Structures are given as structure tokens and as C-alpha cells.
């Protein structure tokens, strides 16, 4: 299937408390492989996946230098943005950056991304053509003109369409055992009597990878959203994900309901029904 490599960066100012907090993390698909945290003892980029540990000292020294450079640019940005929006020194502010690339089944470039946010809102983003920018407001237009003058889009296009896809292919091969696997969900249903008039059915999907999945309920073969509850897909902590969906049903009508589960690991969607 398709795959992706994404890097996420967060910088948070600390009024009257020094240098900003800086955190960077890297992912291949839904799997984290590196991190940098300014509060950490190491002050180095560190491995978070078994398959990246094999990379030599040249790799780790280079990533550490680059990530520290990303940290320093964010440090300057926090100061610049405070000025652009004329914000006071008493408040804490956040900068976020994300970039990366997607490749298709043939491992060829599909698309590239680079987006930036300030205080939880879109600030500036590279368009899908990787040639132009979308600026959220007049302050961001100042940044857009600087970045057009420095040909930032052309630089990112070369990175996203070249370096990014070449390294993602490399990681996909080195972490093949981990990254090119699909774990189908283990499923079951639970039942709880709430009252002599209603009961709840809960449909579970466990130990699945990747994280994308769909859980839906039907009553007599008809999609039903009323009286349903769906929780956000959540990490188990061991590299897989979990999710459930529930419905409150009239007592004694349990068997009229069916839970449907779609996932990349399921050749066919699964259908579950409460069976005591």
C-alpha cells in the first residue's frame, strides 16, 4: 500500500522561565522512529524503533545537528511572531511545524507537505503543487514574501521529492519486519444490562495496525448512528491500536444489531452479533 514519512515539531515559549521547550518526533506510517526533546539529558536525536538503531554515528551526529538547527529557527520564530502580532511578554505561545512525503504502492512519490501553525492555527502552508504558499493572514503574508524571495518552495520541493522519498524507501526496507506488516483486528463483543428496559452492546477491535479502521452499527441491516458511542482510535502501547463502538438497545432486541469492521488487514469486512 501507500506509505509516509512525517516529522513533527513543537516549540513553546516560557515567559520568565528561559529557553522555549522544543520537541521533535519522526514517523514512518503510524510508527515513531526518532525523537528529540530539549528537556532530555542527552541533547541528541534518539532512536525509538529497533530498525533505526543500526544507523551509524554519521547518521546520529547529522540528525542531531539538523534538529538543533530546526530548534534554533523556532526559537527565533517565537520572537518574530510575538512581534508580528504585538503580543505581550507575559504569555506563552506555540509554534508547530510538520512536513513529509507520501509514496504509492510502487514506492514512487505521491505527494509532499510542509505546514506551519502559530497558537494552534494555520499560519502558512505549502500547496500541493509544492510551488506556492497559502498564507492565513497579513502577518503570514510577510513570511510568504520572505520565503518567495529565498525560494523556500523550490528547496522543500527538492527535499520532499528527493531526499524524503529516498530515505523513506530505505527505512521501509530496513524495518520491513515492522513497517510492511498488517495486523488485522482481533474482535469481540461485550454486553451490559443497564436497566430492565435497556442494555449496551460494545464492539471491540484490538491489536491492529495500521491505525485506520472503520466500526459501524446496524439495526436490522440499516446503518445506525443514533444512541451510538465511538471512541477515538487509541494506541495500546506495544505498536498496535485499539478502538470500540457501542450502542444502547431496547432490552431483548440485542440480536437485531450487528457491528461491522473494515480494516486493511481484513480481506472482507467482518460482521459481529451478540451471541451469549
Amino acid at each position: 500500500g501507500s506509505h509516509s514519512m512525517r516529522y513533527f515539531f513543537t516549540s513553546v515559549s516560557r515567559p520568565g522561565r528561559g529557553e522555549p521547550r522544543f520537541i521533535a518526533v519522526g514517523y514512518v506510517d503510524d510508527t515513531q522512529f526518532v525523537r528529540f526533546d530539549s528537556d532530555a539529558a542527552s541533547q541528541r536525536m534518539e532512536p525509538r524503533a529497533p530498525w533505526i538503531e543500526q544507523e551509524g554515528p554519521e547518521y546520529w551526529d547529522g540528525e542531531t545537528r539538523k534538529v538543533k538547527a530546526h530548534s534554533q529557527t523556532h526559537r527565533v520564530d517565537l520572537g518574530t511572531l510575538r512581534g508580528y502580532y504585538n503580543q505581550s511578554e507575559a504569555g506563552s505561545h506555540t509554534v508547530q511545524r510538520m512536513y513529509g512525503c507520501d509514496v504509492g504502492s510502487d514506492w514512487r512519490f505521491l505527494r509532499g507537505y510542509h505546514q506551519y501553525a502559530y497558537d494552534g492555527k494555520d499560519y502558512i502552508a505549502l500547496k500541493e503543487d509544492l510551488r506556492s504558499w497559502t498564507a492565513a493572514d497579513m502577518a503570514a503574508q510577510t513570511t510568504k514574501h520572505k520565503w518567495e524571495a529565498a525560494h523556500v518552495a523550490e528547496q522543500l520541493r527538492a527535499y520532499l521529492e528527493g531526499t524524503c522519498v529516498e530515505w523513506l524507501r530505505r527505512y521501509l526496507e530496513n524495518g520491513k519486519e515492522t513497517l510492511q506488516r498488517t495486523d488485522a483486528p482481533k474482535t469481540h463483543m461485550t454486553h451490559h444490562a443497564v436497566s430492565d428496559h435497556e442494555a449496551t452492546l460494545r464492539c471491540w477491535a484490538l491489536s491492529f495496525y495500521p491505525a485506520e479502521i472503520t466500526l459501524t452499527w446496524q439495526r436490522d441491516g440499516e446503518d445506525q448512528t443514533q444512541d451510538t458511542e465511538l471512541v477515538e482510535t487509541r494506541p495500546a502501547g506495544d505498536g498496535t491500536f485499539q478502538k470500540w463502538a457501542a450502542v444502547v438497545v431496547p432490552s431483548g432486541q440485542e440480536q437485531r444489531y450487528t457491528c461491522h469492521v473494515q480494516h486493511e488487514g481484513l480481506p472482507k469486512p467482518l460482521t459481529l452479533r451478540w451471541e451469549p
Partner: peptide, 10 residues
């Protein structure tokens, strides 16, 4: 790997 180009201050 991280980008070595295209990362500039706002």
C-alpha cells in the same frame, strides 16, 4: 532524515 534545506525563519 530531516531536511537540510527549505527550513528558514518566518
Amino acid at each position: 532524515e530531516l531536511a537540510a534545506i527549505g527550513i528558514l525563519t518566518v
